[PDB]
Amino acid sequence: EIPKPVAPAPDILRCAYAELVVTDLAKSRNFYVDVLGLHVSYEDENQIYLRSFEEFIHHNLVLTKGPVAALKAMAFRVRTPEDVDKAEAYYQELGCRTERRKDGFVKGIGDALRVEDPLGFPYEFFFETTHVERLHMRYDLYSAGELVRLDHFNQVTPDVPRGRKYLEDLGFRVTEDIQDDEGTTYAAWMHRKGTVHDTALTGGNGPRLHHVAFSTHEKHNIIQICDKMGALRISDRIERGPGRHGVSNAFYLFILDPDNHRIEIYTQDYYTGDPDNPTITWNVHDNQRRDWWGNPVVPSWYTEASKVLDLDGNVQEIIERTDDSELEVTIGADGFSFTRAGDEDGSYHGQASKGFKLG
Amino acid sequence: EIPKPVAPAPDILRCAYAELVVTDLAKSRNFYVDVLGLHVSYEDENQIYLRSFEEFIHHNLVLTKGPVAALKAMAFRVRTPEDVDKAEAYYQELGCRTERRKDGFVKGIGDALRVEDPLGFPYEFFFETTHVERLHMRYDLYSAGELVRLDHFNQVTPDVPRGRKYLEDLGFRVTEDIQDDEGTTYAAWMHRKGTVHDTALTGGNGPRLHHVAFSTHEKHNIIQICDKMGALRISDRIERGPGRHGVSNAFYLFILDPDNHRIEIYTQDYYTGDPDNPTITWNVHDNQRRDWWGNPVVPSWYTEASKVLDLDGNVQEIIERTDDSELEVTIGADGFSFTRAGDEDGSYHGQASKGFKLG
Amino acid sequence: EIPKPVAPAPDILRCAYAELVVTDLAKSRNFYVDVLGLHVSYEDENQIYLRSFEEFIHHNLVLTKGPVAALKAMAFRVRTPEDVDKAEAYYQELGCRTERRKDGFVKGIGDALRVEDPLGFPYEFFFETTHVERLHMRYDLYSAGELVRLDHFNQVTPDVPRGRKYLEDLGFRVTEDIQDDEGTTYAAWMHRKGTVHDTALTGGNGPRLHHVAFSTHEKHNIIQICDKMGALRISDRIERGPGRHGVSNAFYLFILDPDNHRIEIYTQDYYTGDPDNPTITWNVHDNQRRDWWGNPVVPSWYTEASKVLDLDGNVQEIIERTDDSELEVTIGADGFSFTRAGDEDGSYHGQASKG
Amino acid sequence: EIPKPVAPAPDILRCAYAELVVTDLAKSRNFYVDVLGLHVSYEDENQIYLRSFEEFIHHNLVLTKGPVAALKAMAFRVRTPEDVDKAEAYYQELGCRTERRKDGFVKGIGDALRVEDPLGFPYEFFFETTHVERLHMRYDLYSAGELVRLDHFNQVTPDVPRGRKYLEDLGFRVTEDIQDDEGTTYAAWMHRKGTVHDTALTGGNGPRLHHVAFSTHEKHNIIQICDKMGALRISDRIERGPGRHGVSNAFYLFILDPDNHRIEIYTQDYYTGDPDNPTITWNVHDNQRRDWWGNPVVPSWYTEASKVLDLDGNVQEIIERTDDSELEVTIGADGFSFTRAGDEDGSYHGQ
Ligand SMILES: O=[N+]([O-])c1ccc(O)c(O)c1
Ligand SMILES: O=[N+]([O-])c1ccc(O)c(O)c1
Ligand SMILES: O=[N+]([O-])c1ccc(O)c(O)c1
Ligand SMILES: [Ca+2]
Ligand SMILES: [Cl-]
Ligand SMILES: [Fe+2]
Ligand SMILES: [Fe+2]
Ligand SMILES: [Fe+2]
Ligand SMILES: [Fe+2]
């Protein structure tokens, strides 16, 4: 349905940064700097520019004060200056609105293209960026919960196959997905950089941003973030986890920022860089697909996500999903999940695993 | 109202082993040896004797084939042979049924006393035991989920203060407890060996055995147990966790054996051996008391526990708790819990944390 | 000095496997399978095919029984079948000897090109491989010391700049190197897959294979390999480490197999896939460059390395390095190293660090 | 030959703190607070009082400014107030010089006895201490290298059997030791609290303090200390390790403070609380006894240790060991070690 352009796709390296609009800059700074330990590249009254421990580009996260909390841009770094021109030509052929600024939208980025993509998401493509001190061996700064890299984005969109085809044409390869036996796709993960993903599509009303993910070196680092949140008496901001994912095999945690933007902390997924990397499809009823240990997925994880902005800074209208809901088919009234395919024992009918039901 | 005897209490070193009755020895062997990796000290068609990686006494766990799965004995090692005689005189003065075997009740234990204690529990006291090869440096055998020590037992009993007084007279010192503002005690932890506990009392219908706990060296060892259970497609036997406890500060997991006996895997609590070790009392509505990260306690954790046997091998009758239920006051339809005392933000009314209600 | 071909370079994805000739297949099996826990994809009385925990291609390591212990092939996977034709045309234009087999040289590999490259190393390029069960979630098999991926090779070669230019034309990017203030290069690391390296050049007499490196998930996994080696009373096969590397920032261990083939266990380097990834150059006298904690590098690590074979299976003649020796300039009799640049305190004259 | 008093021994709970004299308080503070992340219980211009993450007593370490860097006191907590009276009567009977301060020698400690013990070491015994906030769940303060408990001391003394018997009389039990076939004891580890040790005796010239040890939760915490020292470009102050010990089975690291006091960071030894805990004896020539991975023990680890003070603050005179030297019999010119007993492959001679 989204046609393959004749113009060549830009060569995308990786997810690079997200610009999030936040309502109280000081409160958000306390979360991202004082709680999570991200490193300040620049700040003023209106914006905070943050980077992870191993990053050498100017930032992985820009926090921009505004009236309505939202994703303003998810940004991908491209291989060459010329790929920014390629991006503009490709999205113009797709019929999308685009904006080009030769000196960047945010500080520390040069020539950049922002687009309203066909799924309603504000993507940025850039090559030029101000390099900064790469802090990877600054163990004098290293925190017990240190965030070392930006890893991925996760986007909520109503029609996953439509989005998946478009991202494949753009050069992302699907590594894993969740489907059922009736033709429905609930989620797909897709990459450029050779990890399980750079972005992912989650079926639901959208466009909305599900989360931004940062990695740690080790599992104990994620444990420490939880432990610190308990010490700060903000354990109510731990949404889900910690856990082992089935999809991706990573150890993970989901937490919520002061504007309810969801952040994932993630570690130890696998290499996907080979072009015939085997695609893994999980059945939506498999209770080990999202949490390998079977722990239930809280309903807010399926229903809540961040607004996204258009190029004018207005909120994008939400389009309802008409395909089946993962929540409904797994933990809802008519839901079903299994631990062992075909075994009634360890199965759940109309409720979540481990003795819980939907609140 | 359990009187303090005139006879001197035995000097108790530590929890040493449990004897659990199991209905299918081979299935229980698969769980304890093949899944959990405990080391066999002796086995035949009737029993399997198991020890942890660091142990030098003959065993920490005896699995005994029988018709009805239950706790048959929870054993404490005493400091000298003469302390077994002290235990005998002590329980005789309490008016408890005792049985003394100069030869032992199980293999690898010598002179031993079993008693039906005033809370209905089968306690064993012994000094003499057959030493075995201490495996602590056998890294050729070490598994990714290695269980290194037996840490503690946890007992369900209807009246926590009655039991705690009796354990205090036996020499156990309370480290932590859970109470409400109108004077109900829900749980207490108490020790002899300088950790948070050797045994613990959980308010509920009793006598029942809540769990037996083993330690690991590190937190990743507990994560591996979960990961392994997912790979074996037995994630439905992971009851609760992993997590960080509030009480004890230990990293933990609860799993269920083939007869539903609950096993805890635990690591990294703190030193309590000083006699003025500061006690910690938690409020029952504090949602960080059990899981520090605020994750909900699954209802089965509060309701399900193993039968216990009397000295004839018959199941002890259960007495109902009349004080308030922890489940009901925290996650039940009339329950409540808080993240920050006094704050409605992050508080839960009539349901569990994180968005679940009771299934 | 090695010219850049007009023919396009093959698109190389990553290092994929090594073929090692070993002299006692049973002793080598005990080391790589029983001690290190690698997984057997295939075996017979002449060869063992092994793979790491997260691999889906047929193997990462082939142990081949033979009379002389040596590297027989270092193999890189290329992006398409057509890239094996590109590699062929490229090495022909370099004037290198090549051999192409549509059915592969070893089991589980299809159409493959082997070459004696300009530095005397036996390189293999392939696309086609037999997929196997990816064991990445088989935590029922997971060892406390589990090796999860093949990470890189390290090659000993007398002239590093000469080598570096050749690998860069082949599409490898230098991420880190070791130089001095007198124009000598002692080592360079270079990548395709976006980690610090897929191969590396260590200045010394060659061609010889320094080591093959496998990864673990976490640092405790490397600690366990050491602990296990102590329990098996084979701690004498631990050569160096464990440690933190300066170059790469990875946590590491060097151990020796039964034929003295050196294996590195490695974890937690950083992302290098951006094209302007900043290059890091260490000074050869910086005593934190190889072991970040300043632990001394044992002379065997500099002097010992594996023989390599040509396409006929004969040992390649060793060419002597005439540029300065990293050993001599840092820990030899007239050696020097520093902890802090310009500070006499914490410096070492004519001896290794730490006593 | 140290006679056992008739007076009963105090009941010692555990090693509790050390008082180290340091020459530059600000440099020392940098090391112990900014590098190692110990928590300040009290400070002024003459002393810094520090504690570990899980401690509730006032401190584990006192840094006192003075002209000569030395150990001033190694303090053990006793079970009751009356055990301080017992310690006084005990050491008086031993013929040792003692000093009782009913209000303590350092802040945060109450009634305390200091003694010049029969091996020349300044021991303190106290019960009363000011309790402080136990930081064990303050994960907002937790460092990647966090020191969680004080674990033990290690004393260098010339005659190990002589000091071992004295410590056994005091209620310490030996858990491990190092011996040769000829009957020489080179080291012994002994405990009260149910870990491998609260103190240890190293054969060498003494009295000198070999080290004070702190524990971490996990091995990665020790790795981080090393990584941090690399980043601060003070890797020259890493003396030995990190490693797995043979004796104790603990993961370890040894580092040097600005006055060359040696600090060990230590984790994951085993339980010794049972009275028939099996004692392990290693052969001095076994190359896995000290570092299990067979890494060499740098000679400075055997020859360097801190001076100790007497009760007047003067340096205690040193007595030179006449028994065989572990350095000499293993890495000296006529020394040797093995990986596997009886096997020349993996053995080391004069090296
Ligand atoms: O916080 N609780 O759930 C606890 C704390 C420690 C335990 O050993 C336990 O079984 C429960
Ligand atoms: O710093 N060096 O010693 C290095 C760095 C990375 C390596 O993989 C290696 O084999 C050596
Ligand atoms: O094996 N040794 O070298 C040891 C073992 C334990 C220790 O605490 C120590 O300081 C030295
Ligand atoms: Ca269906
Ligand atoms: Cl998920
Ligand atoms: Fe994600
Ligand atoms: Fe427990
Ligand atoms: Fe390497
Ligand atoms: Fe020590």
UniProtKB/TrEMBL annotation, chain D:
Residue ranges of domain VOC in the record: 14-128, 149-268
Stored Pfam families: Glyoxalase
Keyword annotations: Calcium, Dioxygenase, Metal-binding, Oxidoreductase
Amino acids binding Mn(2+): H152, H211, E264
GO terms of molecular function: dioxygenase activity; metal ion binding
Binding positions for Fe(3+) per the UniProt entry: H152, H211, E264
InterPro entries xref list: DHPA_dOase_Mn/Fe (IPR011981), Glyas_Bleomycin-R_OHBP_Dase (IPR029068), Glyas_Fos-R_dOase_dom (IPR004360), GlyoxalaseI/FosfomycinResist (IPR050383), HPCD_C_sf (IPR044904), VOC_core (IPR037523)
Binding residues annotated for Ca(2+), in chain numbering: D181, E182
SUPFAM superfamilies the UniProt entry points to: Glyoxalase/Bleomycin resistance protein/Dihydroxybiphenyl dioxygenase
Residues that, per the record, bind Fe(2+): H152, H211, E264
Metal-binding among keywords: yes
Entries under NCBIfam families matching the protein: HpaD (TIGR02295)
PANTHER family according to UniProt: GLYOXALASE FAMILY PROTEIN
Name recorded for this polypeptide: Homoprotocatechuate 2,3-dioxygenase
